[PDB]
Amino acid sequence: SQVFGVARIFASFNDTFVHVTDLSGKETIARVTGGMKVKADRDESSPYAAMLAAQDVAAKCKEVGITAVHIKLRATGGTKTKTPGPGGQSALRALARSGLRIGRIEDVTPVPSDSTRRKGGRRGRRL
């Protein structure tokens, strides 16, 4: 039917990555971050910047031949937060409303089997 890439979306709390590869992931087709759409550091991870990022990502994809994508959402993971950033849901919604068709959706947040020590110290970050 359609020709699938894989939209590997990394939505942290400081930025939002929209990166579409082939199925293998060794070939990158389009990579637009929320920081290429705004000039303020404070909203690099905003839903607005992620939606704009997906439209440019979506815009670049049609001219290469990608008509549909699979979604691999991840949060920062590791020792840091496992919840996705605010930009991951809007960039995903933008892709569906941009004419790209969506296949499988998966969370690929890296999750440790206990892991190494987390930054911040014993008492946490005191504010």
Partner: protein
């Protein structure tokens, strides 16, 4: 004086319990003491579950859930309104809010 009969934790018949880091501030908190919430949230907000389903290449594809278990220390949880200050008599109630 003594504020709680459970000492604000869940350690009885035990010497030591391994710590956990608060999700929000990374403070070391004992596992029995940590305020724990298990969240199973829909991955797509209810506004967007329709248009992405129209855009789906699969007929009758069920959207996956987002599974997460969150750990908070006492300062973060009180601040984030996950738990609230209760009256002296209302503190004892330990059933989940309905």
């Amino acid at each position: 004086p003594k504020k709680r009969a459970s000492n604000g934790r869940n350690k009885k018949g035990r010497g030591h319990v391994k710590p956990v880091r608060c999700l929000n501030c990374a403070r070391c908190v004992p596992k029995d003491k940590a305020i724990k919430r298990v969240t199973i949230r829909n991955m797509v907000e209810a506004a967007a579950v329709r248009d992405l389903s129209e855009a789906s290449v699969y007929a009758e594809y069920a959207l996956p859930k987002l599974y997460n278990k969150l750990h908070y220390c006492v300062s973060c949880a009180i601040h984030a309104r996950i738990v609230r200050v209760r009256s002296r008599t209302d503190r004892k109630i330990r059933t989940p809010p309905q």
